């Protein structure tokens, strides 16, 4: 039983993030618990302040006509309990609920460990025989406590796109709003545990330049390459199957190379030292002690810049 | 209280994918949230446009007779909320819901990392004392936003099989429809992280051809073989127990061999170099430096072609 | 309000497997979705065909008296929706529901990778002041689509034990039926990934017979034993704590030995080659090159036969 | 509307285990499905046998006053369906339900792989204005089929503590009962898979006593120590964070030591064999070939006895 | 229908922990099952003791007006069943429920294995046209059995913040309370399994100071470094992505270094022993046998103190 308007009835929206959590990078989802504030002139139940009762009359959802506000990008039926329904005299209804639903916002891992994200909550609403436009009321949209959590992410700002997008979806215009959660990752735990340790092995790898023992130069370059995989695997796991290239997926791959050519070298510092030509061998090995680290620091300044600087 | 027809009452269906996600390869399932659009002539509640009310009359599900449309291949009771029920004058009912259920579609890992899939949604409907045929209305079946997600898969097309299949299931014909979601995997993250790294170790493995040290030739071929298993395990994990052979399950197995005979060789470059016959040894070892890589690139072109080319 | 019989009211049962899946070996459970067909003479609501209405009258569950059919071996309250209730003239009721419940059938891993299983569904029913016998109607018991899934198992036959077992449970006879799902495992993925690779290492292990280097004979027999554990671990994991012996638990254990005595040998090919008695050492080592593989192929023919052949 | 007694109304309880399963060692819980039998004199609905109806009158739960019997140690609301309610003439009510709830009983891993447990089910009941004492009726308490499962545990006996404990909990005495499930673990799968394999490596470890190669003595003692961890990890995983010491946690830790001092020795059989004093070295190494295995079998008889013998 | 007060109606709260469990460090949540006790003067249903019925009148929730007490930091709708509602004469209502909900309290891993935590439960309550203040009644707040579990944590005290915090949230003051659960971890299983074993390898690592074999000095320092990662990985897994530094994340990282410079040394005890200057080499190697262990015990006393002592 919808409110007999004379034009498209506006519905005023607003989300108050109460909790944020379980941002699942693999899954590309996160869970939010928050307030949903709605309002509208249903002149149909205006009510003679003085003439009866009091300032504002409290209804149960069965009584009033209420607008169906479905969240767009959610796994399941949004799981909300109702808090208060308070109809003003002029027929103005005041609705508040407290949902908890896991949202399906996408993320851009193009800078992986050093990436900033922009999450989305949605809210369409289909029309019947009056048109429905939704729109935000910014006093119930300052939704974000001073407690918003979201483990391992710094949260930058909860804001929203004022102008809705109105579709025509199956011979009935709907109206969709865009609630925006900006977050930067707390890269860091990534250095002491991945970036650094992954670098350290790479160096030890090429300790085997100042060495002439093939036995201990493979027991060297090779023993480390193994352990690199154990990082490539560690990382490739807590991350999804991107169709593009990660930053750390780059430097983690660019690494693979400086092990191959490391191995190349020790390998040939030998079919060139057993070929009685240690003239050369100890010339090459002497060289790699510079070639490698430089082209690395060079290729990192090349790579690094290729991702952030552009 | 079903609609007194004069023949098999047609029910018009239609799914609008709103969300796609959590495609579980191990499980052979995926979760979808989407619109379900139904319609039918229940001439029984036709209604004198002019004579009363308005263009179309809105009912609650309790009032009207509504067709039971169960999804066939679903783990649990499909989890749907109703959106709108709008009966036209001629007795034509307009139904719309927004379900979220995890579907059990099978997948063919015969090309694993480079595989395209065709997912299914179903919708039977049992007859009572009128027969029920279901069928698709293609304006509520363009179901797929420009946001359909499905992480790590490119989505090719959401379409459907117009002609239903009508069974006789327990002395009551049912009618089943076939909704088709075509997807190709975003192979790629598979290279920098599996294909390539898995190749690199194989090479270093057989660096130990240009070597005469047994100590460092096993510390070589063997140290890498280990690391191969650590890939075979990595891969065998995020994949199910196929009764057939995978592509990467092939090349990952074909790999096992070039390590065995690598080991064979270094092993015999020794009971043949200690047997004072380095004549031969340094003949064999010299050979494997070609035999191996070739028979590999050969067996890959043989294998690769055996899977894609046929 | 139960049907006033003159003797034990028979209830006619019948299950139509619609879906099978998530057979959990560790858990010893599996999930099934399927039809449950019941029937009984409640002469109490017979109904004058001609005199009123039609052929058969449709009731809702609240109206009729319906027999409580609880599934015996289930984790939780069986999760079923009702499909149709159709009372015949003579007072014969026709009931059909579509449950989805996870069953707790035990399995016998005595042949692990090569094992056939017999799963169970149950259905007791307690008596009140008439006795209740249950029994199967085999036209609603041909329950098994041509789609029954059950990943990684071949399904042999869904059948049922006609003669129920009638208990006396707490001063009230109940009646239990036995629905049987026979399945064989798709052993196979077990070879290319476990059986074979697990064998291959065992062989390389004892390459160190044709070797005199202790350094590379331990770097040999030992480096493989490690990798065996990595299989014993892989397998012991996707399997439960049996109080008896598995097949593969056998050959996986029998394996442990041929590494110990392998190690024994290389170990003594040395305190016997450094003791200037290479007379003996190169006699023993020469021997093991036969002793081992034979006693293995022998102990496998012994073991294998001890499990399947008996 | 509770029964107007003249003293504390006794309620007669009784549990019939139908199923047992998913005993979760990490979680310290297990799931049970079983019958719950209750009874009491509600003289208030006594009923003139001859004067009307029959022997016993069947009620629905809404009609009668029924005692709230909550299970004490359960994760969630016990999940039960009702089976039969049968009021005797003298006002004696006969109640039966069939719940399935996961119980939170603690376990004592002090003898881990060889441990016997005693599980608990509870049943309090709060008083109102008559006091409620609960108590067991041992004919509905022989609850345990000849099918009770509980994978990987032998089940010894389902019994119960006749005398309830009556509390005063918040100005209202409650009454709690103690249902006891005694189980012994099927240790065994623990030997062929853990105990034994974990021993075998320890031996090979100290094959490196009959060796003089440091290269192959570390490639020895060390290669095995790794593999021990892989057991310590395997075990530490399918087990909780005990504040006390396990048996196998002991012997698994006592093991760590015989590797350290093994390493200590090989290590010093060298800074003592390169120090031209092979006099000593080959005296120590000669010794450890007895010292170790003995002090182990000794420290095991010491340890083993310290756990079971006391 | 809320109670016509003359000022802000106080609601008296109180939680009785019945169960605690599944504290998820990664997730930063834990599950609790407990009593929730509420009360308030609804003078509106005062009731003439003598004049009718008895001492106190029992209602069902539909009858009375009951305050909506939502838990603040919870994943989902708190899952509670009602136990008793008992209105006193003066209009004083007595409410009791038994909820089971998983709470989202944060944790501070800054001392990881040796850390004490303070968990939170919340309970807001929104006002309508009377204001609502909540507040604790400490006789239903002694909530904690002598059975509170919480595996692997010692539980210190369940207490609560008497003075609520009253917000203005969306033109309606709410009132929030703070229930505090203090727990210390049972560090320990962390030693025999992590701390110790992680140390032991580090030592063996630098056995390779009393060695001159490069072959067995890399087969030494390197073989252990690998095994360290296998701890860094073990630990990094059962812990979340902190934006700060852990204790064990420190010492686990500080460890990485003493392997690098260990490797540095053995590496240079060689390009300095092959450079015919064993003068120096056996001077350095001689040194590291003190430098290392000291700077470690020093850097641990430095580190350890940097975390606990400050
Ligand atoms: Sb190794």
mmCIF file with all atom_site columns, N, CA, C and O in Angstrom, chain B residues 162-196:
data_model
loop_
_atom_site.group_PDB
_atom_site.id
_atom_site.type_symbol
_atom_site.label_atom_id
_atom_site.label_alt_id
_atom_site.label_comp_id
_atom_site.label_asym_id
_atom_site.label_entity_id
_atom_site.label_seq_id
_atom_site.pdbx_PDB_ins_code
_atom_site.Cartn_x
_atom_site.Cartn_y
_atom_site.Cartn_z
_atom_site.occupancy
_atom_site.B_iso_or_equiv
_atom_site.pdbx_formal_charge
_atom_site.auth_seq_id
_atom_site.auth_comp_id
_atom_site.auth_asym_id
_atom_site.auth_atom_id
_atom_site.pdbx_PDB_model_num
ATOM 1   N N  . UNK B 1 162 ? 15.982 -22.311 -24.306 1.00 0.00 ? 162 UNK B N  1
ATOM 2   C CA . UNK B 1 162 ? 14.588 -21.993 -24.462 1.00 0.00 ? 162 UNK B CA 1
ATOM 3   C C  . UNK B 1 162 ? 13.678 -23.200 -24.201 1.00 0.00 ? 162 UNK B C  1
ATOM 4   O O  . UNK B 1 162 ? 12.797 -23.134 -23.343 1.00 0.00 ? 162 UNK B O  1
ATOM 5   N N  . UNK B 1 163 ? 13.911 -24.299 -24.925 1.00 0.00 ? 163 UNK B N  1
ATOM 6   C CA . UNK B 1 163 ? 13.060 -25.496 -24.852 1.00 0.00 ? 163 UNK B CA 1
ATOM 7   C C  . UNK B 1 163 ? 13.311 -26.299 -23.567 1.00 0.00 ? 163 UNK B C  1
ATOM 8   O O  . UNK B 1 163 ? 14.352 -26.943 -23.422 1.00 0.00 ? 163 UNK B O  1
ATOM 9   N N  . UNK B 1 164 ? 12.342 -26.274 -22.636 1.00 0.00 ? 164 UNK B N  1
ATOM 10  C CA . UNK B 1 164 ? 12.523 -27.008 -21.388 1.00 0.00 ? 164 UNK B CA 1
ATOM 11  C C  . UNK B 1 164 ? 12.494 -28.507 -21.637 1.00 0.00 ? 164 UNK B C  1
ATOM 12  O O  . UNK B 1 164 ? 12.064 -29.001 -22.700 1.00 0.00 ? 164 UNK B O  1
ATOM 13  N N  . UNK B 1 165 ? 12.967 -29.240 -20.645 1.00 0.00 ? 165 UNK B N  1
ATOM 14  C CA . UNK B 1 165 ? 12.841 -30.675 -20.701 1.00 0.00 ? 165 UNK B CA 1
ATOM 15  C C  . UNK B 1 165 ? 11.759 -31.067 -19.723 1.00 0.00 ? 165 UNK B C  1
ATOM 16  O O  . UNK B 1 165 ? 11.863 -30.746 -18.541 1.00 0.00 ? 165 UNK B O  1
ATOM 17  N N  . UNK B 1 166 ? 10.727 -31.748 -20.216 1.00 0.00 ? 166 UNK B N  1
ATOM 18  C CA . UNK B 1 166 ? 9.629  -32.168 -19.361 1.00 0.00 ? 166 UNK B CA 1
ATOM 19  C C  . UNK B 1 166 ? 9.735  -33.649 -19.012 1.00 0.00 ? 166 UNK B C  1
ATOM 20  O O  . UNK B 1 166 ? 9.720  -34.503 -19.880 1.00 0.00 ? 166 UNK B O  1
ATOM 21  N N  . UNK B 1 167 ? 9.863  -33.940 -17.728 1.00 0.00 ? 167 UNK B N  1
ATOM 22  C CA . UNK B 1 167 ? 10.042 -35.299 -17.258 1.00 0.00 ? 167 UNK B CA 1
ATOM 23  C C  . UNK B 1 167 ? 8.730  -35.895 -16.873 1.00 0.00 ? 167 UNK B C  1
ATOM 24  O O  . UNK B 1 167 ? 7.702  -35.229 -16.847 1.00 0.00 ? 167 UNK B O  1
ATOM 25  N N  . UNK B 1 168 ? 8.775  -37.161 -16.537 1.00 0.00 ? 168 UNK B N  1
ATOM 26  C CA . UNK B 1 168 ? 7.738  -37.747 -15.732 1.00 0.00 ? 168 UNK B CA 1
ATOM 27  C C  . UNK B 1 168 ? 8.491  -38.228 -14.511 1.00 0.00 ? 168 UNK B C  1
ATOM 28  O O  . UNK B 1 168 ? 9.292  -39.174 -14.553 1.00 0.00 ? 168 UNK B O  1
ATOM 29  N N  . UNK B 1 169 ? 8.283  -37.521 -13.424 1.00 0.00 ? 169 UNK B N  1
ATOM 30  C CA . UNK B 1 169 ? 8.933  -37.896 -12.203 1.00 0.00 ? 169 UNK B CA 1
ATOM 31  C C  . UNK B 1 169 ? 7.908  -38.227 -11.129 1.00 0.00 ? 169 UNK B C  1
ATOM 32  O O  . UNK B 1 169 ? 7.256  -37.337 -10.584 1.00 0.00 ? 169 UNK B O  1
ATOM 33  N N  . UNK B 1 170 ? 7.762  -39.521 -10.842 1.00 0.00 ? 170 UNK B N  1
ATOM 34  C CA . UNK B 1 170 ? 6.776  -40.002 -9.865  1.00 0.00 ? 170 UNK B CA 1
ATOM 35  C C  . UNK B 1 170 ? 5.337  -39.602 -10.200 1.00 0.00 ? 170 UNK B C  1
ATOM 36  O O  . UNK B 1 170 ? 4.740  -38.785 -9.523  1.00 0.00 ? 170 UNK B O  1
ATOM 37  N N  . UNK B 1 171 ? 4.802  -40.185 -11.264 1.00 0.00 ? 171 UNK B N  1
ATOM 38  C CA . UNK B 1 171 ? 3.422  -39.968 -11.658 1.00 0.00 ? 171 UNK B CA 1
ATOM 39  C C  . UNK B 1 171 ? 3.039  -38.492 -11.629 1.00 0.00 ? 171 UNK B C  1
ATOM 40  O O  . UNK B 1 171 ? 1.929  -38.145 -11.235 1.00 0.00 ? 171 UNK B O  1
ATOM 41  N N  . UNK B 1 172 ? 3.961  -37.626 -12.048 1.00 0.00 ? 172 UNK B N  1
ATOM 42  C CA . UNK B 1 172 ? 3.688  -36.191 -12.187 1.00 0.00 ? 172 UNK B CA 1
ATOM 43  C C  . UNK B 1 172 ? 4.760  -35.509 -13.015 1.00 0.00 ? 172 UNK B C  1
ATOM 44  O O  . UNK B 1 172 ? 5.888  -35.360 -12.555 1.00 0.00 ? 172 UNK B O  1
ATOM 45  N N  . UNK B 1 173 ? 4.416  -35.086 -14.226 1.00 0.00 ? 173 UNK B N  1
ATOM 46  C CA . UNK B 1 173 ? 5.406  -34.450 -15.074 1.00 0.00 ? 173 UNK B CA 1
ATOM 47  C C  . UNK B 1 173 ? 5.908  -33.188 -14.392 1.00 0.00 ? 173 UNK B C  1
ATOM 48  O O  . UNK B 1 173 ? 5.142  -32.401 -13.855 1.00 0.00 ? 173 UNK B O  1
ATOM 49  N N  . UNK B 1 174 ? 7.252  -33.065 -14.413 1.00 0.00 ? 174 UNK B N  1
ATOM 50  C CA . UNK B 1 174 ? 7.866  -31.804 -14.018 1.00 0.00 ? 174 UNK B CA 1
ATOM 51  C C  . UNK B 1 174 ? 8.453  -31.144 -15.246 1.00 0.00 ? 174 UNK B C  1
ATOM 52  O O  . UNK B 1 174 ? 8.445  -31.722 -16.337 1.00 0.00 ? 174 UNK B O  1
ATOM 53  N N  . UNK B 1 175 ? 8.949  -29.928 -15.075 1.00 0.00 ? 175 UNK B N  1
ATOM 54  C CA . UNK B 1 175 ? 9.474  -29.186 -16.205 1.00 0.00 ? 175 UNK B CA 1
ATOM 55  C C  . UNK B 1 175 ? 10.674 -28.408 -15.767 1.00 0.00 ? 175 UNK B C  1
ATOM 56  O O  . UNK B 1 175 ? 10.571 -27.557 -14.896 1.00 0.00 ? 175 UNK B O  1
ATOM 57  N N  . UNK B 1 176 ? 11.806 -28.695 -16.403 1.00 0.00 ? 176 UNK B N  1
ATOM 58  C CA . UNK B 1 176 ? 13.113 -28.155 -16.015 1.00 0.00 ? 176 UNK B CA 1
ATOM 59  C C  . UNK B 1 176 ? 13.718 -27.274 -17.112 1.00 0.00 ? 176 UNK B C  1
ATOM 60  O O  . UNK B 1 176 ? 13.599 -27.593 -18.319 1.00 0.00 ? 176 UNK B O  1
ATOM 61  N N  . UNK B 1 177 ? 14.358 -26.179 -16.686 1.00 0.00 ? 177 UNK B N  1
ATOM 62  C CA . UNK B 1 177 ? 14.950 -25.199 -17.599 1.00 0.00 ? 177 UNK B CA 1
ATOM 63  C C  . UNK B 1 177 ? 16.439 -25.144 -17.382 1.00 0.00 ? 177 UNK B C  1
ATOM 64  O O  . UNK B 1 177 ? 16.902 -25.510 -16.323 1.00 0.00 ? 177 UNK B O  1
ATOM 65  N N  . UNK B 1 178 ? 17.193 -24.667 -18.368 1.00 0.00 ? 178 UNK B N  1
ATOM 66  C CA . UNK B 1 178 ? 18.655 -24.678 -18.259 1.00 0.00 ? 178 UNK B CA 1
ATOM 67  C C  . UNK B 1 178 ? 19.314 -23.297 -18.431 1.00 0.00 ? 178 UNK B C  1
ATOM 68  O O  . UNK B 1 178 ? 19.479 -22.820 -19.553 1.00 0.00 ? 178 UNK B O  1
ATOM 69  N N  . UNK B 1 179 ? 19.689 -22.655 -17.324 1.00 0.00 ? 179 UNK B N  1
ATOM 70  C CA . UNK B 1 179 ? 20.371 -21.357 -17.396 1.00 0.00 ? 179 UNK B CA 1
ATOM 71  C C  . UNK B 1 179 ? 21.891 -21.503 -17.381 1.00 0.00 ? 179 UNK B C  1
ATOM 72  O O  . UNK B 1 179 ? 22.465 -22.097 -16.468 1.00 0.00 ? 179 UNK B O  1
ATOM 73  N N  . UNK B 1 180 ? 22.535 -20.941 -18.403 1.00 0.00 ? 180 UNK B N  1
ATOM 74  C CA . UNK B 1 180 ? 23.949 -21.210 -18.706 1.00 0.00 ? 180 UNK B CA 1
ATOM 75  C C  . UNK B 1 180 ? 24.897 -20.022 -18.495 1.00 0.00 ? 180 UNK B C  1
ATOM 76  O O  . UNK B 1 180 ? 24.780 -18.997 -19.159 1.00 0.00 ? 180 UNK B O  1
ATOM 77  N N  . UNK B 1 181 ? 25.855 -20.185 -17.588 1.00 0.00 ? 181 UNK B N  1
ATOM 78  C CA . UNK B 1 181 ? 26.918 -19.193 -17.401 1.00 0.00 ? 181 UNK B CA 1
ATOM 79  C C  . UNK B 1 181 ? 28.295 -19.675 -17.905 1.00 0.00 ? 181 UNK B C  1
ATOM 80  O O  . UNK B 1 181 ? 28.925 -20.558 -17.302 1.00 0.00 ? 181 UNK B O  1
ATOM 81  N N  . UNK B 1 182 ? 28.751 -19.085 -19.013 1.00 0.00 ? 182 UNK B N  1
ATOM 82  C CA . UNK B 1 182 ? 30.013 -19.467 -19.659 1.00 0.00 ? 182 UNK B CA 1
ATOM 83  C C  . UNK B 1 182 ? 31.149 -18.585 -19.149 1.00 0.00 ? 182 UNK B C  1
ATOM 84  O O  . UNK B 1 182 ? 31.069 -17.356 -19.185 1.00 0.00 ? 182 UNK B O  1
ATOM 85  N N  . UNK B 1 183 ? 32.207 -19.225 -18.667 1.00 0.00 ? 183 UNK B N  1
ATOM 86  C CA . UNK B 1 183 ? 33.352 -18.517 -18.105 1.00 0.00 ? 183 UNK B CA 1
ATOM 87  C C  . UNK B 1 183 ? 34.673 -19.128 -18.546 1.00 0.00 ? 183 UNK B C  1
ATOM 88  O O  . UNK B 1 183 ? 34.793 -20.346 -18.658 1.00 0.00 ? 183 UNK B O  1
ATOM 89  N N  . UNK B 1 184 ? 35.665 -18.279 -18.794 1.00 0.00 ? 184 UNK B N  1
ATOM 90  C CA . UNK B 1 184 ? 37.028 -18.747 -19.008 1.00 0.00 ? 184 UNK B CA 1
ATOM 91  C C  . UNK B 1 184 ? 37.900 -18.337 -17.820 1.00 0.00 ? 184 UNK B C  1
ATOM 92  O O  . UNK B 1 184 ? 37.748 -17.248 -17.285 1.00 0.00 ? 184 UNK B O  1
ATOM 93  N N  . UNK B 1 185 ? 38.810 -19.205 -17.399 1.00 0.00 ? 185 UNK B N  1
ATOM 94  C CA . UNK B 1 185 ? 39.685 -18.856 -16.297 1.00 0.00 ? 185 UNK B CA 1
ATOM 95  C C  . UNK B 1 185 ? 40.695 -17.821 -16.745 1.00 0.00 ? 185 UNK B C  1
ATOM 96  O O  . UNK B 1 185 ? 41.113 -17.782 -17.904 1.00 0.00 ? 185 UNK B O  1
ATOM 97  N N  . UNK B 1 186 ? 41.050 -16.956 -15.803 1.00 0.00 ? 186 UNK B N  1
ATOM 98  C CA . UNK B 1 186 ? 42.184 -16.053 -15.943 1.00 0.00 ? 186 UNK B CA 1
ATOM 99  C C  . UNK B 1 186 ? 43.421 -16.781 -15.486 1.00 0.00 ? 186 UNK B C  1
ATOM 100 O O  . UNK B 1 186 ? 43.890 -16.582 -14.350 1.00 0.00 ? 186 UNK B O  1
ATOM 101 N N  . UNK B 1 187 ? 43.888 -17.669 -16.369 1.00 0.00 ? 187 UNK B N  1
ATOM 102 C CA . UNK B 1 187 ? 45.216 -18.263 -16.284 1.00 0.00 ? 187 UNK B CA 1
ATOM 103 C C  . UNK B 1 187 ? 46.134 -17.083 -16.399 1.00 0.00 ? 187 UNK B C  1
ATOM 104 O O  . UNK B 1 187 ? 45.821 -16.116 -17.106 1.00 0.00 ? 187 UNK B O  1
ATOM 105 N N  . UNK B 1 188 ? 47.245 -17.180 -15.705 1.00 0.00 ? 188 UNK B N  1
ATOM 106 C CA . UNK B 1 188 ? 48.190 -16.101 -15.768 1.00 0.00 ? 188 UNK B CA 1
ATOM 107 C C  . UNK B 1 188 ? 48.922 -16.132 -14.474 1.00 0.00 ? 188 UNK B C  1
ATOM 108 O O  . UNK B 1 188 ? 50.091 -16.512 -14.434 1.00 0.00 ? 188 UNK B O  1
ATOM 109 N N  . UNK B 1 189 ? 48.286 -15.713 -13.408 1.00 0.00 ? 189 UNK B N  1
ATOM 110 C CA . UNK B 1 189 ? 48.844 -15.783 -12.068 1.00 0.00 ? 189 UNK B CA 1
ATOM 111 C C  . UNK B 1 189 ? 49.438 -17.180 -11.895 1.00 0.00 ? 189 UNK B C  1
ATOM 112 O O  . UNK B 1 189 ? 50.232 -17.433 -10.969 1.00 0.00 ? 189 UNK B O  1
ATOM 113 N N  . UNK B 1 190 ? 49.062 -18.063 -12.827 1.00 0.00 ? 190 UNK B N  1
ATOM 114 C CA . UNK B 1 190 ? 49.550 -19.436 -12.889 1.00 0.00 ? 190 UNK B CA 1
ATOM 115 C C  . UNK B 1 190 ? 50.975 -19.528 -13.440 1.00 0.00 ? 190 UNK B C  1
ATOM 116 O O  . UNK B 1 190 ? 51.711 -20.449 -13.089 1.00 0.00 ? 190 UNK B O  1
ATOM 117 N N  . UNK B 1 191 ? 51.373 -18.568 -14.275 1.00 0.00 ? 191 UNK B N  1
ATOM 118 C CA . UNK B 1 191 ? 52.742 -18.555 -14.815 1.00 0.00 ? 191 UNK B CA 1
ATOM 119 C C  . UNK B 1 191 ? 53.820 -18.045 -13.844 1.00 0.00 ? 191 UNK B C  1
ATOM 120 O O  . UNK B 1 191 ? 54.691 -18.802 -13.421 1.00 0.00 ? 191 UNK B O  1
ATOM 121 N N  . UNK B 1 192 ? 53.766 -16.754 -13.491 1.00 0.00 ? 192 UNK B N  1
ATOM 122 C CA . UNK B 1 192 ? 54.746 -16.163 -12.589 1.00 0.00 ? 192 UNK B CA 1
ATOM 123 C C  . UNK B 1 192 ? 54.871 -16.937 -11.283 1.00 0.00 ? 192 UNK B C  1
ATOM 124 O O  . UNK B 1 192 ? 55.871 -16.765 -10.572 1.00 0.00 ? 192 UNK B O  1
ATOM 125 N N  . UNK B 1 193 ? 53.892 -17.788 -10.991 1.00 0.00 ? 193 UNK B N  1
ATOM 126 C CA . UNK B 1 193 ? 53.790 -18.400 -9.678  1.00 0.00 ? 193 UNK B CA 1
ATOM 127 C C  . UNK B 1 193 ? 53.869 -19.921 -9.664  1.00 0.00 ? 193 UNK B C  1
ATOM 128 O O  . UNK B 1 193 ? 54.159 -20.525 -8.621  1.00 0.00 ? 193 UNK B O  1
ATOM 129 N N  . UNK B 1 194 ? 53.618 -20.534 -10.818 1.00 0.00 ? 194 UNK B N  1
ATOM 130 C CA . UNK B 1 194 ? 53.617 -21.997 -10.920 1.00 0.00 ? 194 UNK B CA 1
ATOM 131 C C  . UNK B 1 194 ? 54.358 -22.525 -12.141 1.00 0.00 ? 194 UNK B C  1
ATOM 132 O O  . UNK B 1 194 ? 55.294 -23.308 -12.038 1.00 0.00 ? 194 UNK B O  1
ATOM 133 N N  . UNK B 1 195 ? 53.887 -22.109 -13.305 1.00 0.00 ? 195 UNK B N  1
ATOM 134 C CA . UNK B 1 195 ? 54.402 -22.600 -14.567 1.00 0.00 ? 195 UNK B CA 1
ATOM 135 C C  . UNK B 1 195 ? 55.866 -22.251 -14.670 1.00 0.00 ? 195 UNK B C  1
ATOM 136 O O  . UNK B 1 195 ? 56.713 -23.142 -14.759 1.00 0.00 ? 195 UNK B O  1
ATOM 137 N N  . UNK B 1 196 ? 56.162 -20.957 -14.647 1.00 0.00 ? 196 UNK B N  1
ATOM 138 C CA . UNK B 1 196 ? 57.547 -20.523 -14.708 1.00 0.00 ? 196 UNK B CA 1
ATOM 139 C C  . UNK B 1 196 ? 58.387 -21.075 -13.568 1.00 0.00 ? 196 UNK B C  1
ATOM 140 O O  . UNK B 1 196 ? 59.251 -21.900 -13.824 1.00 0.00 ? 196 UNK B O  1
#
